[PDB]
Amino acid sequence: PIATPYPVKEWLQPKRYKAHLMGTTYVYDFPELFRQASSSQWKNFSADVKLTDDFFISNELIEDENGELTEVEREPGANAIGMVAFKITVKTPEYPRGRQFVVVANDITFKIGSFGPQEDEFFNKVTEYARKRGIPRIYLAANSGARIGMAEEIVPLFQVAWNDAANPDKGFQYLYLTSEGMETLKKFDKENSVLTERTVINGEERFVIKTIIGSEDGLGVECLRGSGLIAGATSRAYHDIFTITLVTCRSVGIGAYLVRLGQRAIQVEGQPIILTGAPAINKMLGREVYTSNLQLGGTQIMYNNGVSHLTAVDDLAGVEKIVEWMSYVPAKRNMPVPILETKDTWDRPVDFTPTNDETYDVRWMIEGRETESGFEYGLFDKGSFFETLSGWAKGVVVGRARLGGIPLGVIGVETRTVENLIPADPANPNSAETLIQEPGQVWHPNSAFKTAQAINDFNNGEQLPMMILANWRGFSGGQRDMFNEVLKYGSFIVDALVDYKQPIIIYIPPTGELRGGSWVVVDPTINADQMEMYADVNARAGVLEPQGMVGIKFRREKLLDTMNRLELLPIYGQISLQFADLHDRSSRMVAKGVISKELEWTEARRFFFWRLRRRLNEEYLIKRLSHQVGEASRLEKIARIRSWYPASVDHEDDRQVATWIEENYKTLDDKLKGLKLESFA
Amino acid sequence: PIATPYPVKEWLQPKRYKAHLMGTTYVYDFPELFRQASSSQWKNFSADVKLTDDFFISNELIEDENGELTEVEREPGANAIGMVAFKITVKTPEYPRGRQFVVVANDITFKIGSFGPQEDEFFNKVTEYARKRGIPRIYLAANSGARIGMAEEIVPLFQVAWNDAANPDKGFQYLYLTSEGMETLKKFDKENSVLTERTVINGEERFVIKTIIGSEDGLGVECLRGSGLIAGATSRAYHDIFTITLVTCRSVGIGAYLVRLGQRAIQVEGQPIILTGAPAINKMLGREVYTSNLQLGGTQIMYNNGVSHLTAVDDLAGVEKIVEWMSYVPAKRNMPVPILETKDTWDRPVDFTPTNDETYDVRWMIEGRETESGFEYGLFDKGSFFETLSGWAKGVVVGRARLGGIPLGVIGVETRTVENLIPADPANPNSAETLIQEPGQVWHPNSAFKTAQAINDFNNGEQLPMMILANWRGFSGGQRDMFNEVLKYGSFIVDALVDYKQPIIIYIPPTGELRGGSWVVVDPTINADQMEMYADVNARAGVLEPQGMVGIKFRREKLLDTMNRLELLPIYGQISLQFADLHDRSSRMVAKGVISKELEWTEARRFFFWRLRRRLNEEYLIKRLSHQVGEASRLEKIARIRSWYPASVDHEDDRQVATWIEENYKTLDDKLKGLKLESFA
Ligand SMILES: Cc1ccc2cc(CC3CCN(C(=O)c4cc(-c5ccccc5)nc5ccccc45)CC3)ccc2n1
Numbered sequence A, B: 001p002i003a004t005p006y007p008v009k010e011w012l013q014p015k016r017y018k019a020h021l022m023g024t025t026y027v028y029d030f031p032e033l034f035r036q037a038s039s040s041q042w043k044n045f046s047a048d049v050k051l052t053d054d055f056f057i058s059n060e061l062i063e064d065e066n067g068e069l070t071e072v073e074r075e076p077g078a079n080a081i082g083m084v085a086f087k088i089t090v091k092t093p094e095y096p097r098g099r100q101f102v103v104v105a106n107d108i109t110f111k112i113g114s115f116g117p118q119e120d121e122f123f124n125k126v127t128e129y130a131r132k133r134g135i136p137r138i139y140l141a142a143n144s145g146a147r148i149g150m151a152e153e154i155v156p157l158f159q160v161a162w163n164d165a166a167n168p169d170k171g172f173q174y175l176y177l178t179s180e181g182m183e184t185l186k187k188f189d190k191e192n193s194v195l196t197e198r199t200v201i202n203g204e205e206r207f208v209i210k211t212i213i214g215s216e217d218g219l220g221v222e223c224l225r226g227s228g229l230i231a232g233a234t235s236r237a238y239h240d241i242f243t244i245t246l247v248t249c250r251s252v253g254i255g256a257y258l259v260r261l262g263q264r265a266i267q268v269e270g271q272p273i274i275l276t277g278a279p280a281i282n283k284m285l286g287r288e289v290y291t292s293n294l295q296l297g298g299t300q301i302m303y304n305n306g307v308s309h310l311t312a313v314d315d316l317a318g319v320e321k322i323v324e325w326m327s328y329v330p331a332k333r334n335m336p337v338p339i340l341e342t343k344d345t346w347d348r349p350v351d352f353t354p355t356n357d358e359t360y361d362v363r364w365m366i367e368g369r370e371t372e373s374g375f376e377y378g379l380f381d382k383g384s385f386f387e388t389l390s391g392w393a394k395g396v397v398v399g400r401a402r403l404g405g406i407p408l409g410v411i412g413v414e415t416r417t418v419e420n421l422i423p424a425d426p427a428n429p430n431s432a433e434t435l436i437q438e439p440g441q442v443w444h445p446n447s448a449f450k451t452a453q454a455i456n457d458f459n460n461g462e463q464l465p466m467m468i469l470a471n472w473r474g475f476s477g478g479q480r481d482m483f484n485e486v487l488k489y490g491s492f493i494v495d496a497l498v499d500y501k502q503p504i505i506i507y508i509p510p511t512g513e514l515r516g517g518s519w520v521v522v523d524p525t526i527n528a529d530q531m532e533m534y535a536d537v538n539a540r541a542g543v544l545e546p547q548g549m550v551g552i553k554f555r556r557e558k559l560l561d562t563m564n565r566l567e568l569l570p571i572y573g574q575i576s577l578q579f580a581d582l583h584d585r586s587s588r589m590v591a592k593g594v595i596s597k598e599l600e601w602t603e604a605r606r607f608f609f610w611r612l613r614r615r616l617n618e619e620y621l622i623k624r625l626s627h628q629v630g631e632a633s634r635l636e637k638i639a640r641i642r643s644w645y646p647a648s649v650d651h652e653d654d655r656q657v658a659t660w661i662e663e664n665y666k667t668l669d670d671k672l673k674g675l676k677l678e679s680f681a
């Protein structure tokens, strides 16, 4: 384009234009997208705040002569390999003084973003760089999978030993190199390009090729090794630092695995996540089964799958979601979760309240609801709910939120029936679109899996506390769901809880319940060090529902003995139901000692804010001791810590405990430093 | 029955008869089944061996006044709770001097084997007892799930405040107790059985019941807490000790979860594993959808599911399988895997060999094949293959085996297509039986999951080394399998490998291959501390198959430039294929350094036996150092250890290294004890 006001970026650097022709942002332009998203982050938090350009810094990372990563400022497109990375230092609302993370990305313009050995080792090197520092690792996927190739240098000289030069159509015995060929190879110092066995047949000496190696690196299995290297590297990263991936253009083979292994993923619409392309699969099946890769790995697959946690309309939207997601996680591994108080202060009642005879969206209880007569506040901070995995297993709702500024993972139950429509596979003619009815308050294979996935994702890397508004009748025990292994997924939940490292709150909501099958997987004893359970005064819980209980312990016979109190079975049947229901109250739960407290929904925000803040504080103190006295149970630690509180402080008063502790952090630190004396030598 | 030769056991103890009427062995008779199975174990190993009754000892475990477990010899049926346990000490072929394990079981005759709080705490107490000692925990499931009940004492006295004594059909306002009732309760010291509010209405004073608590323990949520307690307890046990469960009669609710959480499970035919019973589910759906619980949790569900690893014709068969399974695992956590040499010695060639143009069952390569001209030996010890999870995801084959006596987990690939027939769910009228074609050498969601499950099951509790005869073309990238999340299951494999703690051998078989998608998940770099890869001289590996490679790097144009070597596309197309194929040889793998060695199938048993034995030995030495010098990478440890070998010993000679090490264990132990001097104070 001639005569533009400013320089034509796409001309100054043709690679930028190639990227665009490919439907993705040029890799070197992504740091600018992060600056833009970060700026927006501020405007949304505080319209005023005068922001300067030093609030965002991006330094490209490359390997020095010794293979170690260092920072450089160079012209975009100078990358010698197809993988690039940047260290981002950015001041944000949660971290005004700045937080850091790295961004690794394929360069779709460099050999179609293929993963060659060098790209793989660079990617691995960047992952370790992030893990060592404990900072988040953002991956931007735009690739063609493992790099392929043949030893081109052997193509113009190989000879074929036919069964008879007369009719080639008769076949060949092997391929070989003449003494002339062996020479052409030695002339270019490419003798290792081939493995041969010198044998003379009638005419001349023919070196039979037993194996083709090639002089150029990155043709086959060496690309597979590096492929596995970064797969395992990413598997580890996920249990270590916050990991996330943006699928910004196709992501193929190892590319698709990196997306899942990183777990948290945002798919830009129209950018497929595939294993094998449609053309190839069509060859596998014989006919023209698939039209595009989007049928195999588009958002309708992966987002409905749970592989993609969120979809983005474009690259910038993807970056914004990443930035939004990061606002809930620690600046780095083991640092405190980022407190961020906003307009919606902790001290207030909860407005929206569910009713037994009225349908509702659990999201209203979570983030509040907008009504004609004004906004009704929910349990958590207004506008702080960030839902994820929203395109899969709608039976359960998961996301991040803030409670008076405290970030945490939230799991709620969708009470409304879900219409899960499964498309028909083109590969099968006899296939027809299928509709699955997923009853509310019932775990299914998908929703059980999602529940566990969320717990693990809240725990690993995010290191967030969690609240589960437990409200399930049980798991689906029908044949299809049972055959579909609902037990394995249900069990994944218990496993996830056992592994949780931050405070957990299990709370049965106002019109909610827990029964024999559901309570099993969320009881506080699964992980007593982190879990606490609470039931609303209007919640219910017992092994069986009232109907089921009477149908077994208040049979027709016993129902008649009661006729001796005053045809009339209808009303008496109702009486027995109420008799049973009077057993499933929060009061019995308190009496039997299975919950910490029974609560009143409207007061829940106030109670949980201080309960959580109080816990974050004691936990902090407990960890400090776990690095001193060492050998000591949690019971002994938490007890010693509480022995330091002033005698008149009421251990049961959350607000008092939290308040006294924050007033004496340094004083408590002195008592700890002085405890080092307990250095059993 | 009168006039029997010996006492009528079922009469002496009626509970034994009740158990039988229920289709299961009386709990106290199970130890005898273990003795029988153990005796058989010997006969099968050595027909001769004169066995005495002291080779098997079973001591029931009960809680003493302080709640601690102790041994007792008492009359069967004296159990005050519905859960029982035994400590078994038994000499076996693998452990001639004896090995121990515990057996916990529901007593189906005690309150239908329901899980009450006491049963739950006993079960938990036994699990910890086993974990502390590091011994296997066998669970025999025969139950009705969580115990239920109502406060019976409140049934004969509750009163109802009708809207008008005239027409009860009009409803009631609440239930209450008269001053007479409150007295009946105080007379039996059951005042807490109810929560009321004294209010006087016209007539007398009526105490409105707000909550029914009940005096008897085990009615509701207290059964749910204990339920969650043992769920989490079992979740932990699985990552700690060898865990296994025999479903000997129905296993309900928490009962079904215990089976999965324990992971390894053997289902006796006709004994259902269910969440909710058919009658109840029929109520849920309205109509008479299900006939029996077997439709919901019978072997056709759970065995085809992968929830049940094996099925047994009867209780005794179940016990035998348990005993057989245990013969491959350490007597207790962290003890060496049980070496058990048999007739089939290590020093011999492998007979059965696959052919490219011939269908075969991978089991033949594993355990050998019986033919008309005699027995053809496989890679592993004759008769040592114990397949598991054989009713699910047949695309992959898993089991335990012995290599010259060394036990290990084995994973092989089923090359034959699998006909996976999925029954139709009665709940859906529009449902029809479905047939799934699972191509061989291709991972599917189920087979990927099974592959990972096996790795985790070999690692946790079993603590076994592993060999994977890696032979997959890739994962199924079609729509259905992609939508069914094959990526998540594929990723589970990488996770399992990362967590493996024993030596691992990845070996591409004689006619096998690995490609871009499959190699990703089994490369040695995923876990370099334990993994080693090998390729047969007749194996193949590269990113793409030859067809795919030519279709991209040897297009029609380039194919014509080759026409200048001597219509004839057919033969030249064949030529290009061979050109590509010459790239995917074990030789290139060795050159690029991606495998430890290329091998010859017939010599594999000899090579692997000494390679594994050599490794088990170095690993042992490495752990000893990991308890001394501590802070040191594996590279530094393995290096120091090898520095102790005699200078003339060839580190690369497996047999020599293993042999010298076993000759100097004690001498090496002295060098270690002397290394304690390195006690950086
Ligand atoms: C339902 C389903 C889904 C995915 C499956 C994947 C495989 C293995 C891979 C290995 C690697 N591979 C090839 O290497 C290959 C690629 C291409 C191809 C490449 C680029 C464009 C178009 C086609 N064409 C071929 C034809 C015949 C044999 C192999 C090929 C693809 C095939 C096997 C069964 C499958 N079944």
Ligand SMILES: Cc1ccc2cc(CC3CCN(C(=O)c4cc(-c5ccccc5)nc5ccccc45)CC3)ccc2n1
Residues within 6 Å of the ligand: A439, A442, A473, A474, A475, A476, A477, A478, A515, A516, A543, A544, A545, A546, A547, A548, A549, A551, A552, B276, B277, B279, B280, B281, B283, B284
């Ligand atoms: C496809 C599917 C499969 C399993 C499902 C499980 C539930 C929850 C449980 C809670 C506990 N429960 C009861 O408590 C109950 C039990 C029995 C019952 C008990 C013994 C014998 C026969 C029936 N009858 C009832 C009728 C109405 C309401 C509840 C009951 C069973 C119902 C919800 C939806 C389901 N959908």
